[PDB]
């Protein structure tokens, strides 16, 4: 009854940040030692809990959120952070309890001539609430006149493509990010550690 962290991290395909994928972990024992002892991660930062004590605690609901972002945007995946990705794609709460893991994926998510499948949300009327997921593709009204569904003067498509290339700098190279959130609500603690 091992927790299926393999199919999240070792997955072949990753979702876009605006449509970040979410998996839930329940009714299993999680060996976190396999995670924090593997040095294949560029960033591994935990808030409200350390990687060690994770192996000695239990939680009711744990969520792995997987997506792909830019390198220089990995800083935005943190509590109390502002920026395009944080404000419009993925927002973490101030009281966040959990870990953020990010590793470079240039060899997997970059291609010659540009990989344009990954997209991020560029504009929104209001800031994104924590863990809120928005996949609407309506035209963003950027001023006085309405758009009626067309682009132009103060009328832009909210979603823009990344365009990852292998020869780009480390700040432009794609990074795969998994956010592990452990909540421990008033519920049975289905996940535990050895």
């Amino acid at each position, epitope marked *: 009854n091992l927790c299926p962290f393999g199919e999240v991290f070792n997955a072949t395909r990753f979702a876009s940040v605006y449509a970040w994928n979410r998996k839930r972990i329940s009714n299993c024992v999680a060996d976190y030692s396999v995670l924090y002892n593997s040095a294949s991660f560029s960033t591994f930062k935990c808030y409200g809990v350390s990687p060690t004590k994770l192996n000695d605690l239990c939680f009711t609901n744990v969520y792995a959120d997987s997506f792909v972002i830019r390198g220089d945007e990995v800083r935005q995946i943190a509590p109390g952070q502002t920026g395009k990705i944080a404000d419009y794609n993925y927002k973490l709460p101030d009281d966040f309890t959990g870990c953020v893991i990010a590793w470079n994926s240039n060899n997997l998510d970059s291609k010659v001539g540009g990989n344009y499948n990954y997209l991020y949300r560029l504009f929104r009327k209001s800031n994104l609430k924590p863990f809120e997921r928005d996949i609407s593709t309506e035209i963003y009204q950027a001023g006085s006149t309405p758009c009626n569904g067309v682009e132009g003067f103060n009328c832009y498509f909210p979603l823009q493509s990344y365009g990852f290339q292998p020869t780009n*700098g*480390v700040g432009y190279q794609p990074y795969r990010v998994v956010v592990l959130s452990f909540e421990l609500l008033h519920a049975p603690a289905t996940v535990c550690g050895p």
Partner: antibody
Amino acid sequence: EVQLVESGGGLVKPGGSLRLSCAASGFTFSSYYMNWVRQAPGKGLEWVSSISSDGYNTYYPDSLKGRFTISRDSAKNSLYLQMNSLRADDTAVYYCARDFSGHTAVAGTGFEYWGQGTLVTVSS
Amino acid sequence: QPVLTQPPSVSGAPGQRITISCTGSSSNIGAGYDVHWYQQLPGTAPKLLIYGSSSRPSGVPDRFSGSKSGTSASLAITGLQAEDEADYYCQSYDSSLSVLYVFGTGTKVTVLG
């Protein structure tokens, strides 16, 4: 059309600190990575520092031991390099450079445009 | 780690073709990163001459060409001119956050005759 003008160079005592400024014009300032490079008199070229377009990411080589700091200002379209614990080996002509466009294949890898450069001399 | 190596100086008479080598490692050039070439006239700042290891910006004549293969790169100048006497620097990128931009040694080109 792309202008990069440096200022702030001069004499600085060993162990002291100095700030170099670089004004940029002719392009969307907040859309390009910016860099500082240096060249000792009669010597080669060494990359000194780099900053992302938004300005929240900083990159330095380990040789400088973290005594250099790069910042950017879009309210003045300027780029600043602060140098601390300076020594005679840091005496060089410093150039501020603009990286390649983000919509190219060599983004954040080179120095498309260069400034006139300013001479920083560390002496007692 | 730590720099790219170039011949200290390459010389040639006006008319022929000369080449400047740029020897990198598996960390910068063999890692899939392109090479750039900058030309510095005496008393002036460096100017971009070749980017993408084979592409020239506006104002660079076809006499300048670039190539890369394996862990090495090369810059070729065909039909040498007296105005080409200058310092030529190659440059590449390293994925390691402690290195990143790797600069070449630099080659002084002089024209004979």
